[PDB]
Amino acid sequence: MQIFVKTLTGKTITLEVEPSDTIENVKAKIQDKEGIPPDQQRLIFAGKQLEDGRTLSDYNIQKESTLHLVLRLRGG
Amino acid sequence: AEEKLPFPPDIDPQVFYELPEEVQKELMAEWERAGA
């Protein structure tokens, strides 16, 4: 089990998850795969613009559901 | 629109236009404040 988060360059991060993880855990696994700050991560699924206090089961997200990433740039 | 935006590195308008405007457009305003 491991979703396919497509980053802003067409690359696809792939990391393991469960229906007992949360939308902040997927960002924390991306923080392992890319070292990106969850404070700038903006994970999305079918544009249902995800939260930060849910579970993958709460969105019927599957193990290869695929997602997208559209990080914040803040100012520099 | 003179491609003055942060292109071509770090992003492509085919890996972020894959969204509703509501977040592409914030990207298009976030780059304006980014220095562009």
DSSP A19-42: TTS-HHHHHHHHHHHT---TTT--
Q: For residues A18 and A1, give the distance between their C-alpha atoms in angstroms, rounded to a whole number.
A: 8
Please name the residues in contact with A54: beta carbons below 8 A apart, sequence gap of 6 or more.
Answer: A22, A23
Phi-psi sector, A65: left (phi>0), alpha (psi -120 to 50), beta: alpha
Q: Is A50 exposed, middle or buried (0-12, 13-18, 19+ CB in 10 A)?
A: buried
Asked if the Cβ–Cβ distance from A70 to B20 is below 8 Å, we say no
Q: Find chain A residues with C-beta within 8 A of B30's C-beta.
A: 72-74
Q: How many CB atoms lie within 10 A of CB B7?
A: 12
A54 touches chain B (CB under 8 A): no
Q: What is the DSSP letter of A18?
A: -
**Residue keyed to tokens 């979703």:** A3
Residue B6, class by beta-carbon neighbours within 10 Å (0-12 exposed, 13-18 middle, 19+ buried)? middle
- In order of their start, the domains of chain A are 1-76 (3.10.20.90)
Q: How far is B13 from chain A (nearest CA, A)?
A: 9
Tell which residue, B3, B1, B2, B4, has the closest CA to residue B35.
B4
